[PDB]
């Protein structure tokens, strides 16, 4: 997964 | 506003633990979105990436580093620390701590000044 | 990780002129329609400081002869026209995906 907000998705 | 500093010991021996602080400071390491990151530039070199530690305690390292280090954090004092195991001259450079909007923006946009650490006897 | 691939290695403008640093990903730094690098500057014993973000953006404060564009895999830092100020390090970054990497620098030294 990628993109900005990518470390906090789950 | 927002102001980070680091925190470190000036001189270290050879393969010992190195262990930094960032110091944040009029903000919290809490606050959604943003994530912290430890990054050093090896003197004469460029900038090199080491890891982060996002607001809900997420945690990532640089490949590298991964399996000798260990990124922690403390809530209260509002701080967040670094420690390379058995450090080499190849860990002599400038440490800086930064943030990110993770959430939004993505570049690091506060920086500390950065300490410096010197590996040897 | 993608690489980032600056060029050139150092350059020495003159004063007034342009100069042109670009900066090249190994993979596209592209998700949610933008493109997710920024370019830095580092003027010796100082930390980096945003000059521009998401390859387009300009940081507050920053002076206007300086632009980025490109997009997926092909950016261009450009600073026309070059001033006294500008001798300085820059770096270009991915952040579009983990681990997000620097580029080696782009050392300017200005001719006078």
């Known amino acids: 997964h990628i993109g900005p907000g990518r470390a906090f998705y789950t | 506003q927002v102001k980070l500093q680091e925190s470190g010991p000036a001189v270290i021996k050879p393969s010992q633990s190195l262990s930094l602080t960032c110091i944040v400071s009029?903000?919290?390491?809490?606050?959604?979105?943003?994530?912290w990151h430890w990054i050093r530039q090896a003197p004469g070199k460029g900038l090199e990436w080491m890891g982060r530690?996002?607001?809900?305690?997420?945690?990532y390292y640089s490949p590298s580093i991964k399996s000798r280090s260990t990124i922690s954090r403390d809530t209260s004092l509002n701080k967040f620390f670094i420690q390379l195991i058995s450090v080499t001259n190849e860990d002599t450079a400038m440490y800086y701590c930064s943030r990110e909007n993770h959430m939004y923006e993505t570049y690091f946009d506060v920086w500390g000044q950065g300490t410096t650490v010197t590996v040897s006897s | 990780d993608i690489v980032m691939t600056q060029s050139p290695a150092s350059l020495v403008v003159s004063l007034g002129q342009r100069a042109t640093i670009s900066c090249r990903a190994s993979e596209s730094v592209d998700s949610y329609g933008k493109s997710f690098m920024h370019w830095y500057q580092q003027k010796p014993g100082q930390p980096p400081k945003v000059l521009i973000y998401?390859?387009?953006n300009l940081e507050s404060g920053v002076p206007a002869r300086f632009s980025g564009s490109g997009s997926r895999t092909d950016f261009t830092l450009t600073i026309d026209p070059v001033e006294a100020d500008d001798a300085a390090t820059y770096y270009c970054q991915q952040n579009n995906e983990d681990p997000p990497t620097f580029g080696a620098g782009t050392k300017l030294e200005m001719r006078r």
């Open positions: 998401i390859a387009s």
């Open positions: 009029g903000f919290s390491i809490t606050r959604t979105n943003y994530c």
């Open positions: 530690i996002c607001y809900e305690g997420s945690i």
